[PDB]
Design an enzyme around this catalytic site. Structure first.
Site, short mmCIF file in Angstrom:
data_model
loop_
_atom_site.label_atom_id
_atom_site.label_comp_id
_atom_site.label_asym_id
_atom_site.label_seq_id
_atom_site.Cartn_x
_atom_site.Cartn_y
_atom_site.Cartn_z
N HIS A 67 0.81 -1.26 0.00
CA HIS A 67 0.00 0.00 0.00
C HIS A 67 0.83 1.29 0.00
CE1 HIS A 67 -3.83 -2.29 0.92
NE2 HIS A 67 -2.93 -3.12 1.44
N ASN B 122 -10.16 -3.09 2.73
CA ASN B 122 -9.85 -3.13 1.31
C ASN B 122 -11.17 -2.98 0.58
OD1 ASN B 122 -7.01 -3.55 1.62
ND2 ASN B 122 -7.10 -5.70 1.05
N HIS C 153 -3.41 0.80 11.81
CA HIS C 153 -3.04 -0.60 12.19
C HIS C 153 -4.34 -1.15 12.79
CE1 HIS C 153 -0.88 -3.99 13.84
NE2 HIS C 153 -1.54 -3.77 14.98
N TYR D 143 1.56 -4.55 12.04
CA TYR D 143 1.36 -3.09 11.86
C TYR D 143 2.07 -2.27 12.93
CZ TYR D 143 -2.29 -4.20 8.36
OH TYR D 143 -3.00 -4.63 7.30
#
Ligand code: HDE
Ligand code: HDE
Ligand SMILES: [S]
Ligand SMILES: [S]
Lengths: 726, 726
Positions: free
Chosen positions: A101, A174, A365, A388
């Site tokens: 990303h 997503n 995260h 994360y």
């Protein structure tokens, strides 16, 4: 003074449509927009007007055009501290990009719930329809670098940081409801397979290469998300026109301690809309920044991106009521079985001031939860929890990444953690440990409770041996891909077949293409035969006889999986190219712009050069771009007003504009002598559905064009396009 | 075993043409290509076949498919060290990209001189024609990120690391002979102005935005390199077909201590060739990795990139003999005035094994010189000497970046420096300081001398006061832009006009466009008028009357500044598309491929699907790509053989293939019934220069096509393409 005397260097500090003004930092373009988080960043915002240029130590600089040298043709001297500070800062500007990303675009906004959800969660941000929670949202692709192109075929990220009164909650989603793999231990494998291959670092922003398809062919759990990626879901028109999903089952926890399983949804209130592949690919070249630009320009125009947060809710006692495992992140929960309950609305209404400081440095995260939410044992989520926090230690330079302004909570934060690189907070507590007496044990733990309580995990029962083992319940790979395929319209199905076929044509090793076609035969024979035909592959008798996978809980389709089966169009914020000539018919143009204005549709006036042209009645029309400068790829429809058509009739670029738009299924409208352009796209005299035409541009001409735009693309045109050379 | 039975997963370890085999890491593709540096890297190369999968601590893994969990549907356990090591490594894979030149592509090779240069330099690598010096060369763009596209309009970097016996010498050049600015102190201003703008981080890989042209309009020193970037210099066909330049006057120093001024050149033995703008821009979308791919594949095919190193030498007493300052890096030295002496040849013959480890971590820096070279007071070089060491401390993590394998010297290195992050060398010297007795002062200083001596700077006289002041001799900004302009062919001039016009049409603030056109009027009125017309600007009377700047030392042009004025074509390593049909005339194809092979030209066989077709004589022809999968953008010429033309006659993609190649000035050859395609590109019955046609593909047909290919593009076609809708 270097600014022009007429002030035309400074963008208007009010909403303006795309292209009308230069774009600007958000606090200058929209000074009146505020929220609690934007207000709290004011302490680090730095202005510029009327200040002297200084070193970072506050020393005014006299000459910022020269180094210090011994004589004006001499060597540069080591004592030039002003030079060395300036070049040292330049030399260290870059930080590592995100492992995945890396390419993304972000904006500030706010969220509010429609009603209190206290009966199902104690999460403070959902407790009161009057409570407004600032957000910062970053959309992204996955595979390419920060400098890669926006309209690639890929999955898209949709990450929301909610600055709640009980801590940061990051919803890290997503644009598809599932992922390619089941267990986080394989994430580096899958990501290495899709990323540029390690010898030569090709290709950027593309899964169309051998190692991705090798992995897929060898790991059939990936086929569900691959089906999504190969559909037009992989190439959204805008981040405003895609769905978002939280990917996993999480839990809501209410004040009584009741757990409910939940999957998160974002519904785009602008509707669902995707490009087509030739258009998306060509656009990576003509404007690799198109989604970042379209998002920023939407917010500057007041076409604020809006999304409805929704929940699929499953009681605890229904864990095993489906044909698939709720913890398997390669499975979706069909909306026909569990409807999405609407929760609240998010609006993105302010761009950042500085991309690097607020976008590049933001850290999202999914472990960042608040009381009233909890995890489950989904084994992809479980491993995400590790990654994360870890990754920020290199990316953002250490464990104080929450002190970088965009990441700071607006809720209070106090604890006994100290030091680390970049430490901003200066702690006055005499204690740096607990329990302590020397500060009366502050800051103190807080018991859990219905509001403003401490975090306690839901006391889920765990039973079993320590194993590295996949649950047998995850061992089904073809039914969800088949449900998705059967839910698509016939033109969405054709575009899936064309996405697998194009991608596998780029796989150099033919046996990998054969292995993927074998997998497709396990999902649907029609899909597999259609791909095989495009690859010159013939299915075996054994392949022709593979039994299709079972329906999912009696379903043989679910129309909520299609982008287009159920109309949800919205034209506000779309854009039309208006092709000008040197003597435009002004009455046509007045009617076109009047109707576009009324529906909040933008326009760009294009010609063969920059400057202006003058209409038949003397009206001066300012040109936004040339035909070549702002290609049809960048608009939703094309209108050609009448006038001196001879002026542009033999212009290659003008004819090609309409051929490209025609090929890409966009509505096209021709008035009066602009009907002459019918010959370039081979339209019959009696006309055809998707081409609006009339002697003049009104009565029903603009209503017809706007009805075509609400349906996004002219899908009935697909059989006619293979003949046009464009 | 997952590999195919027939071994087709593994490329042959022999040279093969582009597309014939999957690409591979260079030591597996060309195991017997050796040089001192490649052999010295063997200590760190790691293989894989027949080894067990382990942690980084050497522990064998049994199950690399699952996390450890309590029960097979349970939570992941923190004691899973195998998972955490693998995800930790993944989480920290990225390092900061280069501040500029982040996008680049690299290969290994060697250099050898044509003769001893001992009369003018004591540099050991230039001392004997037997001296073979390994090199590693990285070509790059400037503006875009590491994941941005290759065929943007930009300056290109050309950096060569020479591993000499007396130290690393880095010659860190670009593909034009000058730079935009005079003094290093303004580097961050210039680079900030060309880079994506700071509010929204747009645009990637483009100067076509307001801040770049705002800086150019306010800093006329930039106009010379701006002319080069707006010419077709800014869009090379290949890193193999562009020139390199060392940008600055350096010094050569001989054994007697005599200094000669030198500027460095690389001359491409494949000749000079560039794209056209429409093709370059589209190619960023069709294949953003086009130049990286073409370089790797050229080396795999044996079309090794070759450059001749050349010196412009100016005696010290000739320092003030020109009408520009030798120290001003916005000025070129015209070859008509100082010819380039050809000194040696460099050949790139091996790709890296791992892109990140060898390419992304390589550090080049122009301060890395060796005895026999020295600097000058050029104020842009002077500042560079600070930046290239400084920036590595963040980019490569610390001061031991010379221990990263690709960066290590092959010459001995020993000193008293110690420690630093990730220190590899374990020093045994009892001393870490000098002078010392406890190790008899070793390692010891070496006096300067004719060979194997220590470095001593040339004792240039410095006389002046400490000033931040630009030499008045640098204050002339228009004569070199005008020389470059007047040295271009009329079609190169049109492409420059078009580059300025396209770029400035993307500048939103019109007064910036006007200020640029005013600067153009200082250079050449015809240029200024042509740009202005494209922008809808009219020159004022004062503008029409600006006196042109003077000639450069009596030169009114120098044809060495044109890409194409002097024929320099080489077709070896170029590529033709052959458009197949389902019953190809085999005799045409045998003749075509035979003639192409003889000249080292490659072919790609294209069709409407993958798989194979069968020729009239039953010869099975394997298809490399579809028409859409490998567009004309990617080839130098297109050939359509005879056979069943009706199979493709009405294929939109096949027609468009030829239209796009035609618009881009590429040679096109049509045999027998393929001449029916003349109608899609409007070629008259009698034919046109640049279109080869005959009854069949005989001997003369191929000679004609290969002659066109030697001339690169069909410039005479430019007036016909305006009417083509493509
Ligand atoms: C084990 C499976 C697994 C693992 C290990 C990871 N990912 Fe991510 N993912 C990470 C790891 C990293 C590497 O930590 C990283 C890299 C930089 C960072 O700070 O976090 C990251 C980025 C990321 C963003 C960008 C947020 C932004 O705009 O800044 C978004 C939206 C998502 N992800 C969404 C996402 C979903 C939706 C459900 C699913 C499933 C997954 N991902 C899978 C997943
Ligand atoms: C004051 C004027 C000035 C300053 C300060 C700099 N530049 Fe560079 N330039 C730097 C600074 C940095 C920041 O140190 C940086 C960024 C990362 C790094 O390690 O070095 C860098 C990279 C770079 C490469 C790529 C080498 C590779 O493949 O890694 C190439 C080919 C060139 N440059 C070429 C070049 C020329 C030819 C004349 C001229 C002139 C200049 N540049 C001007 C210049
Ligand atoms: S997911
Ligand atoms: S330079």
């Amino acid at each position: 003074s270097l600014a022009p005397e007429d002030g035309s260097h400074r963008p208007a500090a009010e909403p303006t449509p795309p292209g009308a003004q230069p774009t600007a930092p958000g606090s200058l373009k929209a000074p009146d927009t505020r929220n609690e988080k934007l207000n709290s960043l004011e302490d680090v915002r730095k202005g510029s007007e009327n200040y002297a240029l200084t070193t970072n130590q506050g020393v005014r600089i006299a000459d910022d055009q020269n180094s210090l040298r011994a004589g004006s043709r001499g060597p540069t001297l080591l004592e030039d501290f002003i030079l060395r500070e300036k070049i040292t800062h330049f030399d260290h500007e870059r930080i590592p990009e995100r492992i995945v990303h890396a390419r993304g675009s972000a904006a500030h906004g706010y969220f509010q719930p429609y009603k209190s959800l206290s009966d199902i969660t104690k999460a403070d941000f959902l407790s009161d329809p009057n409570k407004i929670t600032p957000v910062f949202v970053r959309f992204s692709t996955v595979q390419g670098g920060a400098g890669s192109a926006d309209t690639v075929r890929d999955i898209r990220g949709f990450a929301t940081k909610f600055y709640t009164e009980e801590g940061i909650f990051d919803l890290v989603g997503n644009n598809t409801p599932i992922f390619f793999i089941q267990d986080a231990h394989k994430f580096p494998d899958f990501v290495h397979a899709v990323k540029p291959e390690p010898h030569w670092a090709i290709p950027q922003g593309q899964s169309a290469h051998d190692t991705f398809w090798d992995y897929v062919s060898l790991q059939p759990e990936t086929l569900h998300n691959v089906m999504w990626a190969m559909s037009d879901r992989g190439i959204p028109r805008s981040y405003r026109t895609m769905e978002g999903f939280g990917c996993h089952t999480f839990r809501l926890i209410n004040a009584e301690g009741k757990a409910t399983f939940v999957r998160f949804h974002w519904k785009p209130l602008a509707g669902k809309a995707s490009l087509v592949w030739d258009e998306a690919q060509k656009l990576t070249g003509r404007d690799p920044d198109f989604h970042r630009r379209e998002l920023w320009e939407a917010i500057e125009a007041g076409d604020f991106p809006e999304y409805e947060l929704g929940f699929q809710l499953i009681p605890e006692e229904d864990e095993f009521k489906f044909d698939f495992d709720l913890l398997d992140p390669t499975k979706l929960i069909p909306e026909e079985l569990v409807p999405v309950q609407r929760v609240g609305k998010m609006v993105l209404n302010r761009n950042p001031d500085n991309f690097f400081a607020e976008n590049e440095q933001a850290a999202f995260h999914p472990g960042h939860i608040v009381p009233g939410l909890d995890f489950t044992n989904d084994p992809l989520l479980q491993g995400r929890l590790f990654s994360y926090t870890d990754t920020q230690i290199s990316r953002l330079g250490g464990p104080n990444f929450h002190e970088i302004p965009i990441n700071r909570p607006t809720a209070p934060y106090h604890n006994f953690q100290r030091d680390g690189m970049h430490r901003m907070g200066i702690d006055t507590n005499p204690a740096n440990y607990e329990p302590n007496s020397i500060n009366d044990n502050w800051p103190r733990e807080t018991p859990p409770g219905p509001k403003r309580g401490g975090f306690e995990s839901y006391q889920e029962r765990v039973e079993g041996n320590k194993v590295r083992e996949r649950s047998p319940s995850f061992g089904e790979y073809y039914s969800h891909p088949r449900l998705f395929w059967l839910s698509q319209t016939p033109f969405e199905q054709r575009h899936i077949v064309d996405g697998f076929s194009f991608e596998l044509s780029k796989v150099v090793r033919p046996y990998i293409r054969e292995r993927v076609v074998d997998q497709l035969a396990h999902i649907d024979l029609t899909l597999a035969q259609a791909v095989a035909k495009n690859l010159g592959i013939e299915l075996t008798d054994d392949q022709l006889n593979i039994t299709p996978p079972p329906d999912v809980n009696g379903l043989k389709k679910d129309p909520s999986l299609s982008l287009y089966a159920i109309p949800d169009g919205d034209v506000k914020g779309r854009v039309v190219a208006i092709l000008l000539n040197d003597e435009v018919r002004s009455a046509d143009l007045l009617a076109i712009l009047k109707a576009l204005k009324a529906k909040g549709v933008h326009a760009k006036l294009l010609y063969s050069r920059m400057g202006e042209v003058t209409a038949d009645d003397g009206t001066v029309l300012p040109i936004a771009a040339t035909f070549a400068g702002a290609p049809s790829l960048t608009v939703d429809a094309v209108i050609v007003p009448a006038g001196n058509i001879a002026d542009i009739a033999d212009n290659g670029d003008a004819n090609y504009y309409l051929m490209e738009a025609y090929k890409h299924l966009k509505p096209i409208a021709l008035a009066g002598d602009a009907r002459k352009f019918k010959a370039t796209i081979k339209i019959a005299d009696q006309g055809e559905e998707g081409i609006v035409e009339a002697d003049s541009a009104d009565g029903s001409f603009m209503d017809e064009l706007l009805t075509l735009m609400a349906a996004h693309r002219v899908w009935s045109r697909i059989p006619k396009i293979d003949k046009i050379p464009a």
